Design a protein around this ligand. Structure first.
Ligand SMILES: [Ca+2]
Ligand SMILES: [Ca+2]
Ligand SMILES: [Ca+2]
Ligand SMILES: [Ca+2]
Ligand SMILES: [Ca+2]
Length: 187
């Protein structure tokens, strides 16, 4: 019987996708930042990233975090565009939308190739799905080719210790998840 690693990685994808997709000062995120600021996230974390989550715990200044998020990702004049189409040549938003639509994923009027949306789709696909064939295409075609470049620019342009930690935390998490999935994909 094969491994279902997305069974444990679903929550990590939803947590990270939430942090890239939404303004940190959204009242809906208060219980999430309470877990981070209280260090309660590492006990239910499917990776071993204790020292990064500890640095996340000590850097929870919501005004500092909010300012950095807006400078990095908000508007057409942001510091590091969070869309796949800004990083991969030839990439279009329509093809990611269509891929997510055919899996049954509800989308908004904001472009479907946002880094947050791609990560949220990974946990949505884990929860309502052919699931593993959908997971491999999401990562191989719409994440791995470009996300390392984006996350590296995030780390260089983030002025806050929170986003200076989250960017490499995301980088390590995606590569660690991919190794576990590929070991089952190519088994
Ligand atoms: Ca390996
Ligand atoms: Ca491994
Ligand atoms: Ca593969
Ligand atoms: Ca195996
Ligand atoms: Ca093996």
């Amino acid at each position: 019987s094969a491994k279902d690693p997305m069974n444990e990685f679903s929550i990590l994808c939803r947590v990270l996708g939430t942090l890239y997709y939404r303004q940190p000062q959204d009242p809906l995120l208060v219980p999430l930042f309470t877990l981070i600021r209280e260090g309660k996230l590492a006990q239910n974390w499917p990776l071993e990233q204790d020292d990064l989550l500890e640095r996340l715990q000590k850097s929870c200044d919501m005004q500092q975090i909010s300012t950095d998020y807006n400078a990095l990702f908000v508007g057409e004049e942001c510091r590091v565009s969070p869309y796949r189409s800004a990083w991969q040549e030839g990439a279009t938003e329509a093809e990611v939308r269509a891929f997510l639509s055919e899996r049954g994923m509800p989308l908004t009027d904001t472009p479907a190739d946002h880094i947050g949306t791609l990560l949220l789709a990974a946990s949505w696909i884990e929860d309502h799905a052919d699931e593993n064939e959908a997971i491999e295409t999401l990562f191989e075609m719409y994440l791995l080719p470009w996300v390392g470049t984006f996350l590296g620019k995030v780390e260089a342009h983030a002025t806050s210790p929170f986003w200076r930690t989250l960017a490499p935390l995301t980088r390590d998490a995606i590569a660690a998840m991919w190794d576990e999935l590929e070991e089952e994909n190519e088994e």
